[PDB]
Structure 1
């Protein structure tokens, strides 16, 4: 009973949504956690491909000077969603002189996703987002979209394949002490991402964001230094 979006099953269980979720649970992982005044959005690169240039292929896209973005899944649909979100953010800023809050833009993205599930002539967007940024009141915020229509104000969740292990590791270590300073959050997220990946430093990227300092990616040298510092475990 799974050949069209509009149809149901004898029990319920709208199946195209579940299949889209299964498709989403196939790409590279992604994490994120907020602190006192800090947010990290680390991801992991599946393949090196030294001939390919890492400049063009990337996941941490910028949505505004106070909102950033990281996806997981099919690339083209995510790019389309990010483009639409950028346009909507600029339009809202034009119509009201106030920097856009995280909740409004994440609701817009969720609605745009949900709109493509109402007729058996358009496939749903199979991706998952990790919208995170700083509001206009200074309160750190984080969210997570979902292919069907939903979104939750998570704290330190994760998406992608093999997300149960990293989620358990994060929930078994997340405490107020680890979110006090700045580099402690980086240490925590690096320790979290080091699990699924084979060898650290080679294919791990971070994006540290501070209070109104805009998105700032990290060069490989700083990543190697942070891994070396976190390697002093005893």
Structure 2
């Protein structure tokens, strides 16, 4: 190994590199996620396709189990390592314990790995922040987030990446319980949040949902077009 202190404290009581490795997350792509009562929804923005290539390998949303889903921001390689180890961990949990994997267990593993990885001798911290969405115990929807420190932190909706303060400001006018909680209206409202992004080109939107019993469904950018059209229709009804 390398016997040196990548972790040193500040003269005023900080960690120079963990809060600062959050900046690499802060300068990555945006991704949101909410829970409905029966259907959970998330998606990433900024596919940033050069219109003439493939994109099926750059997918930032994958799965570890048939119950749980991933998301991240920041740089993608640390996400790839964490996802590989997370697949291994969920399957090793399936080896002993015969349950479907609880979301809280795999988040504790990810956060525990992240903190004992940052603690050790000469290993660069993972500059990601994951979103771990699943519904296992009696179909109860849960979504947790991470941090480069390794703090799993359960929410009901979330916004990360570039300009997440703005996205959460849209989420402020979106924190009503009603908002009618339909599947199409909640998904399209998430779509409207991704529409409140810095560019909102209309074709770079990628969203995937899970209805707490099925598997992952990759959508088709015509249903989202009708979602955007009816969002524009409701915006016209405001006038």
TM-score under structure 1 normalisation?
0.94
2:171 corresponds to 1:170: yes
Q: Does 139-148 or 128-137 show the bigger shift?
A: 128-137
Offset at residue 108 of structure 1 (A): 0.7
**Which sections of structure 1, spanning at least 5 residues, go unmatched?**
none
Count of aligned positions? 234
Q: Is the 8 A contact 2:68 2:133 kept in 1?
A: yes
- Give SS of 1:124's match: coil
RMSD: 2.2
- Give SS of 1:165's match: helix
- Provide the rounded CA distance (Å) in 2 between the counterparts of 1:83 and 1:26: 24
- Provide the rounded CA distance (Å) in 2 between the counterparts of 1:40 and 1:179: 15
Q: Is the 8 A contact 2:68 2:134 kept in 1?
A: yes
| Deviations, residues 64-113 of structure 1 (Å, cap 9, x unaligned) | 11100011011111011001111110110121110011111111111111
Offset at residue 48 of structure 1 (A): 2.2
- Provide the rounded CA distance (Å) in 2 between the counterparts of 1:60 and 1:230: 25
Offset at residue 2 of structure 1 (A): 17
| Deviations, residues 32-51 of structure 1 (Å, cap 9, x unaligned) | 00111111112102522123
- Provide the rounded CA distance (Å) in 2 between the counterparts of 1:181 and 1:187: 10
Q: Does 214-223 or 203-212 show the bigger shift?
A: 214-223
Q: Does 163-172 or 223-232 show the bigger shift?
A: 223-232
- Provide the rounded CA distance (Å) in 2 between the counterparts of 1:86 and 1:16: 28
- Give SS of 2:10's match: coil
TM-score under structure 2 normalisation?
0.92
**Which sections of structure 2, spanning at least 5 residues, go unmatched?**
none
Shift in alpha-carbon separation, 1:91–1:179, aligned structure 2, 3 A: farther
Offset at residue 197 of structure 1 (A): 4.2
- Provide the rounded CA distance (Å) in 2 between the counterparts of 1:55 and 1:85: 21
Offset at residue 120 of structure 1 (A): 4.3
